[PDB]
C-alpha cells in the first residue's frame, strides 16, 4: 500500500521534525536560554545577534523565542529570511517593507525578522540593512544569525545584544539521538552511537543528519553504516595506517590507505582531515607531532591547488615514514 | 588499411551499444543492484545519490533503471543533464522546470532526472538545485552523480539514498571485452587484453573505449595499438627508464624518456602517473620506494602549481603588498 | 512602563548619544575648532582635509560643522561616503552627481560631502577625485578624511585647509569613559577599563562601542565581557600561546588555541590578526619577530585561498615550534 | 563601403617612398633600383613593419607596370615538402625577364620556417638560378637561417615603427573611409600595436567595424588586451596594501577579458614602469615579475621537470 | 656591364673562396698538420676523431687532407655527412653503405666518410656506427667530428687517432683577414679588425663571415658595421647598462637595454653572454662580481627553460641594482 | 700491407686484445679463481652466483670459465642474457629454451647460461627463474650476476656456489698494464703509470684504454699524454682552482679556470666531472665536500639541459666562494 521504508525516512528531515519547540526543550545552552527567557517573561528585548557554529542552537532558539513570545501568532509575527542564498526574489527589499509596515498580531509589542547567515551579506548590503533596521526599530525586532560577530559591521553590532553559542556536549547530543532512535523504530547500537558522536563533534544538526541517512540503509544503526553515510573511516584504521608508516612499514600503510579508500570511497581531503585529528591521539613523541602537523598543513594546500589525491596521500605517508626514523 | 571497416567499427560508441539495459546485466555492483531492483519492484524510490568513479556503473545503472521502470517510455521520462557542461545553475533549474511540469508517459508514477557531475556545482548552485529538487518532489525523482558524497551539501545528502560504486574486478571487465570482441570480429590477443586491463584498472568504460579505439586502427588488437590510443607508455619502458636513472645512468634514462614523449607524445602528468604506478613494481628496497613516492608527489605538485595561474597571480599580488609598504 | 535595562542602553548608539553636536562643544582640540568657527561665522569655507587617528575628532567635528551651516537639516546638506568601502572613483563620482545635482535645501550656500578614508584611494584615483572636487566646487564642498596628510597627493592638498588632530591620550579617552560609565550607571571595573583601552588603540568610537556592548552584557563593565563582545582574546592568552609554541611546547599551544577558539568563538582571521599584533610584544629578538610576522601572512594566504582553518592554524603553531629551534 | 577588403592589403605602399620608418633600409633599397643591380636580399624583423611592403614596392620600381610576372611570391610555410619548391622554380628562373631588369624576384615569405635540410636545398636552388633570379627571403630572426645563405644575402633588419609614423597613416585611412579618430582611440590603437603597423590597421578597422567613431572602449574591446587602467589599478590596490580588493579586480579582468596568467603577466610588466611609485619599488616589482614568469614557465616545462625528477632518482639511486 | 660592389662581395662565401687547399696553408694547428701530413706522405691512415670548436680548422683539415690524398679525386672519394640526422640515423648509415660498397676512384687504397657532429648521436646510435665503422674498415676510413671527445663512446674512441683542434690566436686570424682584405680591396681599419677579433673569440669562420657581411656594406671596414652585422652591442655599451643598473639607476639601465635590443637587435641570450664577458671588466668590488656571476648563471638557465627574455633581462638588471647597494 | 706504427696500435681495442683468456689470466680474485679452476679440473659445477660491482671480474671470469670448460666450443655452449632487459629477455625466451633444448657441442656435459643483473628481477620473477633452474638443471648450468647476493631469494641462493668479487687494486691493475706495455714495445714511465692508475681508479677497462690511446701518440707513455688523451686537466690545477674560490679569491679561481681551459679545451662537463672528483681530495671538512659535490651536480644538470658552459662554470666557482665564506 504505502511507500518503501527507505522513502518513508527520507521524506522529511529529522533535523526539523524534532527541533525543540520551547526555550526549555533546547539543551546545552543553559546560560543563553536564561537570557532569552527574561525577554519572554517581560515582553522586552532589543535587536539580537546570535554568533556561533551551525546546528548548535541559534535558529532553534530564534524560533522557540518567537513561539513563547507570540503564542499562536509567532508564524504571523516572525519573518524568516536567509540573507545568503536569498530564497526567492529580492528577499531583502520590497518583501520587508510589507511585513514591517503592518502591526503585530495580538497585543504583541513588535514583530521579528530573523536574518539567517547575515555575515554572508557584503558590507554594503549590511549598510543598507543597518538603515532598513533602525528604520522600523519601533515596530520590528531583528535577530541576526552569523558565524562570527566580527563579520558584522559595528554600526549593526552596537545595536544588538551579543549571544555566543558554542558546541554541545556529547551527553546532550546523545539524549536527543536516543529519543529520535526509539521514536522512529531504530536499533541504535552503542557502537553506532559513539561513531555518530565522534564525527558530529558537538554539532547537533550534523549528528541527526548522520542518524537519519544511516536509518535509510537499515533500522539498525551500526557504526559501519555511520561511516558509510559520512565520507568517514574508522578512527582505528586511520591511526594504524599512520603508525604503520611511522614505524617504517610504508608499503603496508599504502595498503591500509588503499583499503580505507576502496571501502569508504572518501576523498583525499576526507582522509587528510581524519589524519589531522587522529595524529594527536598517537603514542608519538611531541617533536614528531610538530613535524606531522606541518606536513598535513602543507599537503592540505597541495590538494587545494589541485594536486593528485592518491599521489599526494602516498607522498604524505612516506613523509611519515621519514619523520618516524627521526 | 581498412577501407570502410574504419567507419563501421567506429560509428557508434560500443559503450552506448553494449551498455547493459537490464539491472541484472550489470557486473560488480551486486549489493547496489539488489537495492535498485527493489525500487522497480515497488514503484517507489527516494532521491538517489551515486558516489564513485566514472565508467564503473553509475550511469549504466541509471539507464538500466529508467529502462526497467519506464520500458520503451524511458527516452521521454528519463532526462540526463551534466551539471558542469550545462551553461549554469539557472539553465539547470530551467530545463527540469519544463520536464517536471508534464506528467509521465505510460502511467509511470514519476519521471527521472539524472544530474551528472553534480559535485561540480558550487555551494550556492547546490542551494538552487536543492530548492528545485524539493519543488518537484512529487512528479520527479532525482539521481545525483558525484565523485564524492562529501562534496554534496548536507541538505541534499540527507534526502538521498546513498550508493557507493567501486572499481570492477579485472575478471568481469575481460568477460565483457571478449564478448564485444567476438560480435565485432576482433583478434583479441592475450597481450592486448592484459594491456587494456592494466590501463583501465577497474574502469569498464575506459577499457571499452580503448578496445574499440585499437580496433578502429586494426582488426587485430595488439598491445602496441592499445598503448598507442591509450596514450600510455609500455610499463616495461617506464620501469626501464626509472631503473636506468636509479642505476646511475641519467643520460640513458633521459633518452628513454625523450623517445617516449616523442613516440606517443604523452604528457608530463601521463608519465608521472605511470611512474607513480611502476614505483611499486621495481626490484628495490622499501626505503627507496619511500623516497621515490615522496619525489613523485613533489613533482606532481610542481606540475600542478605551474598550471594553476590564478594561484600564481594572486601570490604575485600578495608579493606586491609586502613590497608596496617597504 | 519601561523596557528592561538591556533595551535602554542599546536603543541608541552611545557614540551618537555622546557626540559633540556643536562646534563650541568639542574638548581637547581647541585650536582646530576655533578655525572651524571662522567659516561658520563667515559663510565661506574651502575644501578641507583632516589628518589624524580614527575617532579622535575627525568625524564629530565635521558633523558639527554641518549643524552650524544648515541648521537642523544637517542631513539634507551633508553627504557621507567611504572611499574604502566604495567600489572606486566612479560609484563615488556618481554619488556626487546626484547629491550636488539639486541645490542645497533652503538658503544654503553649498552642500558638503564628507569622504571618509579618502587616503585609501590609489593615486590614479586621487586624481579623478581632484577632478571631481573642482567641477562641482561651486555647489558642493568636500571634507576629505585621512590618516596622514602625506598620503594625499599634491593637486588635492594644495586646495584644502589642512586640519591635523592629535591622538587622544590613553588615560584621556579614559576620562570620557568613567564619565559615561557613571552617567549611565555602570560599575566600570578598572580591569575592564584597561581592557577597552588596549583594544580601542586610541579610537574613541571603538572604545564607546565596546562599553555600550559590554554594558548591555551587564552593569559591571568587566574584562571578560569586554573581550567577549570585542570578539578578541586576552593579549596575554595570545602571546602565551605563541610563546608556548616557540619554546617547543607545541601540544600546549594547541590547547590554548582550542580554548580560545572554543570559548571566545573567534575566527581564523580574528586569531591571525591578534597573533600578528601580539608577535611584537614578545620577549624575542626582532629578526624572529619579522619571520613570525611573515609566517602569519603566509598561512593567511592559504586560508584566503581555501585551505582548512584548523589544519592551517595548527600548522602555523608548528612553524612556530620549528622557528623557535633555529 | 563596409568591409570589402582588409585596409592592410588595400592601403599598402606601392613606392619605396610611400614606406616610412625604415629609412636606413629604404635608402639602401632605392640604390638597387638606381643601378639595376642587386643580390639575394634577407629581410628579418617583426610582422607589419615593412618587410613585404618593401618586397612589392621594390619589384614595382625594378619592373614597372610589368612586374606581375617578374615577381613569383611564395610562402615558406607551404605543403610539407620542398619537392614542390624546385619544380615551381625550375621553370620560373629558367624563363628570363623582359620589360623589367636583368632578373626576376622570388619573394619567399617566412623563410626561417624551413628545416635545416629544406634550407640547404634552397641554397642550391638559390645558386642554381642565381644569374636568372634573385631571392628575397623574409624571416623573424636571421639567426634562424643557415650561414651559407646569410653570407650570400644583403641583410636588412626591419625595426618596429614609431608612434608618430603609425598614427598619421591610420588617420589618412580614417579621413578617407568615413571614420572618427578621437584621441582616446588613437592612443589606444598605438598602445596595443607597439609599433606593429598591420596590427594597428586591423585594430583601427575592427574597432570601426562597430561604427566610424573610434572610442578607447571599442579598441580594447575588439582586441584581447585589457584596460591598461584596470591592470594599473589592480597593482596600485595591491601596492596600496589592499590585497583583497586587488585580488577582486584581478578576477574581474580574467572574468571579463578571459585572459591567461601570462597575458595578464605581460600587461603588468608593461604598466609597472608607468606607475606613480618611486624607482626602488620598480626594482623590486621588476624582480618579482620575472620570478613569477619563471614559476609559470618552469611549471609548464614538462620535459625539464621530468628530467629533474630522473636526476633525483639518480640521487636516491646512490642508496 | 658590371655589378655594384655590394653584389660582387656576396656572390660566394669567403669562408669557401678562401678556405685553404693544402695542409701547409692551414694555420694555427701546427702539430695536427704534421700528424696528417705523415698520413698522406705514407699512404697509411687510421680512423680519425677531430675534436674542437666550430670554424677553427676541423672541416678544412678533413678536406685539405682529402685533396692531398686523392688529388682531383677528392670530391669522388670524400663524402661528408651530418650525424645530426639530416634525415635520420639509419637513412645516413644507408648513404655510407652505398658509398662504401664501391672501390675508390683513381686507385687509392680507401675512401673517406667525414661525419659531422658525431657527438650528437645517442649511445645506441654511436654503437651502430661503431659497427658500420668496423664493417667497411678496409675500404672506408672515417673522420668523426665533435665538439668534445668525451662525448663519443669509448669503443669508437679507441679505434681513432685523436686530434684536438683549438681556437686560433688573433695574429693568425688577423693575417688571414688582412690578406682577404688586400685581395678584396677593402679598408680594414684598426678598429674594425679589433672588433672582429673581439667578437670571433678565435673562430676563423665566424671572423671571415663578419668581415664579408661588413664588406657588403662598405669597402671601409668599421667597428660600427662589424658590431651591426654581428648582432652584438659594443663592450662599452653593455658595461654602461650594467654600471647604470649597479649604481641605482634601474630605469636608465632598462632604457639602455631597450636601445641595444632595438638598435643592434641582439637576443636575450646574446645580452647575457655579453654581460658575462663584460661584467669582470667593471671597476667593481670582487664580492660584487661574485654575486653578479651567480645571477647571470641563474638567469641563463631561466632562458634555457624558455622564460620571457625582456622580463628576465630587466629582472636581472634589477638584481644588479640590489647587488649594487653594497 | 705495412701501415705505420699508429695504424697498427689502433688496429684493435687493447681491452679486447688483452682480455683474459684463461682463469689464470684473470687478476685480483685469486681465491675465487682457485675455486673456479677446481671446476674445470673435475669437469663439474653447481649453479653459480657472482656478486660484486661491475667491471671487476664477474663476466671476464665467467667467460674464462666457459673457455676452459668448453675450449674452442665455448661460444656454442655459453649463452649470455641480461635480466633487467624485460622486453628482450621475453622476445628471446624462445631462443633460451632452444639453447636449453639442444645438447652441448663437443660432448660437454652441460651448457652455461649467464644471466647478467639477475638482481633486477622481482621476487616472483626470481621464483620463476628457480623453476626453470631446476627444470633444465640437467642440461644447463646457471651463472647469476648481481651487486648483492642479498638481493637474490634464499631458495635460489641455496642452490648456488656464492662468489663475492671485490674491487681491484692499483697493484693488480698496474701489473697488467706493465705486461701490455712490454708486449707492445712501450716505454711505460712511472709518472705515466701513476697517472693512468689515478685516472682509471680501479677500472681495469678504462686503464687499458687510456694506455692504448697514449701509445697511439707515442711509444713512451708520459703523464702528459695520459692526462691529455683522457681529456683531464692536472688534478692539482682543479684543486687549486676550487681552493682559491673557497678562500674568497673568486677572480684568481677564474684566472686558473682560464689557464686550464687555455691549456686544454675541455668541456663544461669535463671540468665538472673532475671537480666532482677532486672536491673529495681537498683538506676540507666532509660536510662541505658533500655540499660542493651536490652543487656541482646541480650545475651539471643545467649544462645537460643546454645552459651556457662558461657562464655556469663561473657561476659555480661563485657558489664555491659563497659557500666558503660561510
Ligand atoms: N540545544 C538544542 N536542543 C535541541 N536540538 C538542537 C539544539 N541545538 C541544535 N539543535 C538541532 O540542530 C538543528 C540546527 O538548528 P540550530 O541549532 O538553530 O542552528 P543553526 O543556526 O545552524 O540553524 C535544529 O533543527 C535542531 O534539531
Ligand atoms: N686553421 C685554419 N686555417 C685556415 N682556415 C681556417 C682555419 N680554421 C678555420 N678556417 C676557416 O673557417 C671555416 C670553417 O671550417 P673549419 O675550420 O673546418 O671548421 P668546422 O669543422 O667547424 O666547419 C673554413 O671555411 C676556413 O676558411
Ligand atoms: N682480471 C682482469 N684482467 C683483465 N681485464 C679485466 C680483469 N677484470 C676485469 N677486466 C676488464 O673489465 C671488463 C668487465 O668485465 P668483468 O670484470 O667480468 O665485470 P662485469 O661483471 O661488470 O662484466 C672485462 O671485459 C675486461 O676488459
CSV table of C-alpha atoms in Angstrom, one decimal, chain A residues 2-305:
chain,number,residue,atom,x,y,z
A,2,UNK,CA,2.4,2.6,1.3
A,3,UNK,CA,5.9,3.5,0.0
A,4,UNK,CA,9.0,1.6,1.0
A,5,UNK,CA,10.7,2.1,4.4
A,6,UNK,CA,13.5,3.9,2.7
A,7,UNK,CA,11.4,6.7,1.2
A,8,UNK,CA,9.5,7.0,4.5
A,9,UNK,CA,12.6,8.0,6.4
A,10,UNK,CA,14.0,10.2,3.7
A,11,UNK,CA,10.8,12.3,3.0
A,12,UNK,CA,11.0,14.7,6.0
A,13,UNK,CA,14.2,15.9,7.7
A,14,UNK,CA,14.6,14.6,11.2
A,15,UNK,CA,16.5,17.8,11.9
A,16,UNK,CA,13.3,19.8,11.5
A,17,UNK,CA,10.7,17.1,12.7
A,18,UNK,CA,12.5,17.1,16.1
A,19,UNK,CA,13.6,20.7,16.6
A,20,UNK,CA,12.7,21.7,20.2
A,21,UNK,CA,9.6,23.9,20.3
A,22,UNK,CA,10.3,25.7,23.6
A,23,UNK,CA,13.1,27.6,25.4
A,24,UNK,CA,13.0,24.8,27.9
A,25,UNK,CA,13.4,22.0,25.3
A,26,UNK,CA,16.7,23.4,24.0
A,27,UNK,CA,19.8,22.0,25.6
A,28,UNK,CA,23.4,22.7,26.4
A,29,UNK,CA,22.9,26.5,26.1
A,30,UNK,CA,21.6,26.9,29.6
A,31,UNK,CA,23.1,30.4,30.0
A,32,UNK,CA,21.8,31.5,26.6
A,33,UNK,CA,18.3,30.5,27.4
A,34,UNK,CA,18.2,32.2,30.8
A,35,UNK,CA,18.9,35.5,29.0
A,36,UNK,CA,16.2,34.7,26.3
A,37,UNK,CA,13.5,33.8,28.9
A,38,UNK,CA,14.0,37.1,30.6
A,39,UNK,CA,12.7,38.6,27.3
A,40,UNK,CA,9.6,36.5,27.0
A,41,UNK,CA,8.8,36.9,30.7
A,42,UNK,CA,8.9,40.7,30.4
A,43,UNK,CA,7.9,41.3,26.8
A,44,UNK,CA,11.0,43.4,26.4
A,45,UNK,CA,14.0,42.7,24.2
A,46,UNK,CA,16.4,44.6,21.8
A,47,UNK,CA,17.9,43.5,18.4
A,48,UNK,CA,19.7,40.2,18.8
A,49,UNK,CA,23.0,38.9,17.4
A,50,UNK,CA,23.4,35.1,17.6
A,51,UNK,CA,27.1,34.2,16.9
A,52,UNK,CA,28.5,30.7,16.7
A,53,UNK,CA,28.6,27.4,14.6
A,54,UNK,CA,25.7,25.9,12.7
A,55,UNK,CA,23.5,23.2,14.3
A,56,UNK,CA,24.1,24.2,17.9
A,57,UNK,CA,21.0,26.2,18.9
A,58,UNK,CA,20.8,29.6,17.2
A,59,UNK,CA,17.8,29.2,14.8
A,60,UNK,CA,16.1,26.7,17.1
A,61,UNK,CA,16.1,29.4,19.7
A,62,UNK,CA,15.2,32.1,17.2
A,63,UNK,CA,12.0,30.1,16.6
A,64,UNK,CA,11.4,28.9,20.2
A,65,UNK,CA,11.7,32.5,21.4
A,66,UNK,CA,9.1,33.9,18.8
A,67,UNK,CA,6.9,31.0,19.8
A,68,UNK,CA,6.8,31.8,23.5
A,69,UNK,CA,6.6,35.4,22.6
A,70,UNK,CA,3.6,35.3,20.3
A,71,UNK,CA,1.9,32.0,21.1
A,72,UNK,CA,-0.2,31.2,18.1
A,73,UNK,CA,1.0,34.4,16.4
A,74,UNK,CA,4.7,33.5,16.1
A,75,UNK,CA,4.1,32.4,12.5
A,76,UNK,CA,2.4,35.7,11.6
A,77,UNK,CA,4.8,37.9,13.5
A,78,UNK,CA,8.1,36.1,12.6
A,79,UNK,CA,9.7,36.6,9.2
A,80,UNK,CA,12.5,34.1,8.4
A,81,UNK,CA,14.8,35.3,5.7
A,82,UNK,CA,18.1,33.7,4.6
A,83,UNK,CA,20.5,36.5,3.6
A,84,UNK,CA,23.0,34.3,1.7
A,85,UNK,CA,21.2,32.0,-0.7
A,86,UNK,CA,18.3,34.6,-0.9
A,87,UNK,CA,15.4,32.1,-1.1
A,88,UNK,CA,13.3,33.6,-3.9
A,89,UNK,CA,13.3,37.2,-5.3
A,90,UNK,CA,14.8,40.3,-3.7
A,91,UNK,CA,14.2,38.8,-0.3
A,92,UNK,CA,15.7,41.9,1.4
A,93,UNK,CA,13.7,44.9,-0.1
A,94,UNK,CA,10.1,45.1,-1.1
A,95,UNK,CA,9.4,42.0,1.0
A,96,UNK,CA,10.4,43.6,4.3
A,97,UNK,CA,8.6,46.9,3.7
A,98,UNK,CA,5.4,44.9,3.7
A,99,UNK,CA,5.9,43.0,6.9
A,100,UNK,CA,7.5,46.0,8.6
A,101,UNK,CA,4.7,48.4,7.8
A,102,UNK,CA,1.8,46.4,9.3
A,103,UNK,CA,1.4,45.8,13.1
A,104,UNK,CA,1.9,42.8,15.4
A,105,UNK,CA,-0.8,40.2,15.9
A,106,UNK,CA,-2.4,40.1,19.3
A,107,UNK,CA,-1.3,42.6,22.0
A,108,UNK,CA,2.3,42.0,20.7
A,109,UNK,CA,4.6,44.9,21.1
A,110,UNK,CA,6.7,44.1,18.0
A,111,UNK,CA,7.5,41.7,15.1
A,112,UNK,CA,10.6,39.7,14.5
A,113,UNK,CA,12.7,39.4,11.3
A,114,UNK,CA,15.2,36.5,11.6
A,115,UNK,CA,18.0,37.2,9.1
A,116,UNK,CA,20.0,33.9,9.0
A,117,UNK,CA,23.5,33.8,7.6
A,118,UNK,CA,23.8,37.5,7.9
A,119,UNK,CA,27.6,37.6,7.7
A,120,UNK,CA,27.2,36.5,4.1
A,121,UNK,CA,25.9,40.0,3.2
A,122,UNK,CA,28.5,42.4,1.8
A,123,UNK,CA,29.5,45.5,3.7
A,124,UNK,CA,27.1,47.5,1.5
A,125,UNK,CA,24.3,45.1,2.0
A,126,UNK,CA,24.9,45.5,5.7
A,127,UNK,CA,24.9,49.2,5.4
A,128,UNK,CA,21.5,49.1,3.8
A,129,UNK,CA,20.4,46.6,6.3
A,130,UNK,CA,21.5,48.9,9.1
A,131,UNK,CA,19.1,51.6,7.9
A,132,UNK,CA,16.4,49.1,7.0
A,133,UNK,CA,17.0,48.1,10.6
A,134,UNK,CA,16.9,51.4,12.6
A,135,UNK,CA,14.0,52.4,10.2
A,136,UNK,CA,11.4,50.0,11.7
A,137,UNK,CA,13.1,49.6,15.1
A,138,UNK,CA,9.9,50.7,16.8
A,139,UNK,CA,7.8,48.0,15.1
A,140,UNK,CA,10.3,45.3,14.2
A,141,UNK,CA,12.9,43.5,16.3
A,142,UNK,CA,15.9,41.9,14.5
A,143,UNK,CA,17.6,38.6,15.2
A,144,UNK,CA,20.7,38.3,13.2
A,145,UNK,CA,22.4,34.8,12.8
A,146,UNK,CA,26.1,34.6,11.9
A,147,UNK,CA,29.2,32.5,12.2
A,148,UNK,CA,31.4,35.3,13.6
A,149,UNK,CA,30.3,38.6,15.2
A,150,UNK,CA,33.5,40.1,13.8
A,151,UNK,CA,32.0,39.7,10.3
A,152,UNK,CA,29.1,42.1,11.1
A,153,UNK,CA,29.8,45.8,10.7
A,154,UNK,CA,29.9,47.6,14.1
A,155,UNK,CA,27.0,50.0,13.4
A,156,UNK,CA,24.7,47.0,13.4
A,157,UNK,CA,26.7,45.2,16.2
A,158,UNK,CA,26.4,48.1,18.6
A,159,UNK,CA,22.5,47.9,18.4
A,160,UNK,CA,22.5,44.2,19.4
A,161,UNK,CA,22.8,42.0,22.5
A,162,UNK,CA,25.5,39.5,21.6
A,163,UNK,CA,24.9,35.8,22.3
A,164,UNK,CA,27.7,33.3,21.6
A,165,UNK,CA,26.5,29.8,21.0
A,166,UNK,CA,29.2,27.1,21.5
A,167,UNK,CA,29.3,23.3,20.7
A,168,UNK,CA,27.1,20.9,22.6
A,169,UNK,CA,28.5,18.2,24.9
A,170,UNK,CA,28.1,14.5,23.8
A,171,UNK,CA,25.6,13.5,26.6
A,172,UNK,CA,23.1,16.1,25.3
A,173,UNK,CA,23.6,15.1,21.7
A,174,UNK,CA,23.2,11.6,22.9
A,175,UNK,CA,19.9,12.0,24.7
A,176,UNK,CA,18.3,13.5,21.6
A,177,UNK,CA,19.7,10.7,19.4
A,178,UNK,CA,18.4,8.1,21.8
A,179,UNK,CA,15.0,9.7,21.7
A,180,UNK,CA,14.7,10.1,17.9
A,181,UNK,CA,16.0,6.5,17.7
A,182,UNK,CA,13.3,4.9,20.0
A,183,UNK,CA,10.6,7.1,18.5
A,184,UNK,CA,11.4,6.0,14.9
A,185,UNK,CA,11.9,2.3,15.1
A,186,UNK,CA,15.7,2.4,15.1
A,187,UNK,CA,18.0,0.0,16.9
A,188,UNK,CA,20.7,2.5,17.9
A,189,UNK,CA,23.7,0.2,18.7
A,190,UNK,CA,26.2,1.8,21.1
A,191,UNK,CA,29.0,1.4,18.5
A,192,UNK,CA,26.9,3.4,16.1
A,193,UNK,CA,26.1,5.9,18.9
A,194,UNK,CA,29.8,6.6,19.6
A,195,UNK,CA,30.5,6.6,15.8
A,196,UNK,CA,28.0,9.5,15.5
A,197,UNK,CA,29.1,11.5,18.5
A,198,UNK,CA,32.7,11.4,17.4
A,199,UNK,CA,32.2,12.6,13.9
A,200,UNK,CA,29.4,15.1,14.8
A,201,UNK,CA,31.8,16.8,17.2
A,202,UNK,CA,29.1,18.8,19.1
A,203,UNK,CA,27.0,19.8,16.1
A,204,UNK,CA,23.5,18.5,16.8
A,205,UNK,CA,22.2,19.0,13.3
A,206,UNK,CA,25.2,17.0,11.9
A,207,UNK,CA,24.5,14.1,14.3
A,208,UNK,CA,20.9,14.0,13.3
A,209,UNK,CA,21.7,14.1,9.6
A,210,UNK,CA,24.0,11.1,10.0
A,211,UNK,CA,21.5,9.2,12.2
A,212,UNK,CA,18.7,9.6,9.6
A,213,UNK,CA,20.8,8.8,6.5
A,214,UNK,CA,22.0,5.8,8.5
A,215,UNK,CA,18.5,4.6,9.2
A,216,UNK,CA,17.6,4.8,5.4
A,217,UNK,CA,20.0,1.9,4.8
A,218,UNK,CA,18.8,-0.1,7.8
A,219,UNK,CA,16.8,0.3,11.0
A,220,UNK,CA,19.8,-1.0,13.0
A,221,UNK,CA,22.2,1.9,13.2
A,222,UNK,CA,25.6,0.3,13.2
A,223,UNK,CA,28.9,2.2,13.2
A,224,UNK,CA,30.0,0.5,10.0
A,225,UNK,CA,27.0,2.3,8.4
A,226,UNK,CA,27.7,5.6,10.3
A,227,UNK,CA,31.0,5.5,8.4
A,228,UNK,CA,29.3,4.6,5.1
A,229,UNK,CA,27.0,7.5,5.3
A,230,UNK,CA,29.6,10.2,6.2
A,231,UNK,CA,32.7,10.1,4.0
A,232,UNK,CA,34.4,8.8,7.1
A,233,UNK,CA,36.6,5.9,8.0
A,234,UNK,CA,37.1,4.0,11.3
A,235,UNK,CA,39.3,6.2,13.6
A,236,UNK,CA,41.1,3.0,14.4
A,237,UNK,CA,42.0,2.3,10.7
A,238,UNK,CA,43.4,5.9,10.2
A,239,UNK,CA,45.7,5.5,13.2
A,240,UNK,CA,47.0,2.1,12.2
A,241,UNK,CA,47.7,3.5,8.7
A,242,UNK,CA,49.8,6.2,10.3
A,243,UNK,CA,51.6,4.2,12.9
A,244,UNK,CA,52.4,1.6,10.3
A,245,UNK,CA,54.1,4.3,8.3
A,246,UNK,CA,55.7,5.9,11.3
A,247,UNK,CA,57.1,2.5,12.4
A,248,UNK,CA,58.6,2.2,8.9
A,249,UNK,CA,56.1,-0.1,7.3
A,250,UNK,CA,55.4,2.3,4.3
A,251,UNK,CA,54.3,-0.4,1.9
A,252,UNK,CA,51.8,-1.7,4.5
A,253,UNK,CA,50.4,1.8,5.2
A,254,UNK,CA,50.0,2.3,1.5
A,255,UNK,CA,48.0,-1.0,1.6
A,256,UNK,CA,45.8,0.2,4.5
A,257,UNK,CA,45.2,3.5,2.7
A,258,UNK,CA,44.2,1.6,-0.3
A,259,UNK,CA,41.6,-0.3,1.6
A,260,UNK,CA,40.1,2.6,3.6
A,261,UNK,CA,40.0,4.4,0.2
A,262,UNK,CA,38.2,1.5,-1.6
A,263,UNK,CA,35.8,0.6,1.2
A,264,UNK,CA,34.7,4.1,2.1
A,265,UNK,CA,35.2,5.9,-1.2
A,266,UNK,CA,36.2,9.1,0.7
A,267,UNK,CA,38.2,12.0,-0.7
A,268,UNK,CA,41.8,12.9,-0.1
A,269,UNK,CA,40.6,15.9,1.9
A,270,UNK,CA,38.4,13.5,3.9
A,271,UNK,CA,41.4,11.3,4.8
A,272,UNK,CA,43.7,14.3,5.5
A,273,UNK,CA,41.1,15.8,7.9
A,274,UNK,CA,40.8,12.5,9.7
A,275,UNK,CA,44.6,12.2,9.7
A,276,UNK,CA,44.9,15.7,11.3
A,277,UNK,CA,42.5,14.6,14.0
A,278,UNK,CA,44.0,11.2,14.9
A,279,UNK,CA,47.6,12.3,14.7
A,280,UNK,CA,47.1,13.8,18.1
A,281,UNK,CA,45.8,10.6,19.7
A,282,UNK,CA,49.1,8.8,18.9
A,283,UNK,CA,51.8,7.5,21.3
A,284,UNK,CA,54.3,9.6,19.5
A,285,UNK,CA,57.0,11.9,21.0
A,286,UNK,CA,55.9,15.6,20.8
A,287,UNK,CA,58.5,16.7,18.3
A,288,UNK,CA,57.1,14.2,15.8
A,289,UNK,CA,53.6,15.6,16.1
A,290,UNK,CA,55.1,19.0,15.3
A,291,UNK,CA,56.5,17.7,12.1
A,292,UNK,CA,53.5,15.7,11.3
A,293,UNK,CA,51.2,18.7,11.8
A,294,UNK,CA,53.3,20.9,9.5
A,295,UNK,CA,53.2,18.3,6.7
A,296,UNK,CA,49.4,17.9,6.9
A,297,UNK,CA,49.1,21.6,6.6
A,298,UNK,CA,51.4,21.7,3.5
A,299,UNK,CA,49.7,18.7,1.8
A,300,UNK,CA,46.3,20.2,2.5
A,301,UNK,CA,47.4,23.2,0.5
A,302,UNK,CA,48.6,20.9,-2.3
A,303,UNK,CA,45.2,19.4,-2.5
A,304,UNK,CA,43.6,22.8,-2.6
A,305,UNK,CA,45.8,23.7,-5.7
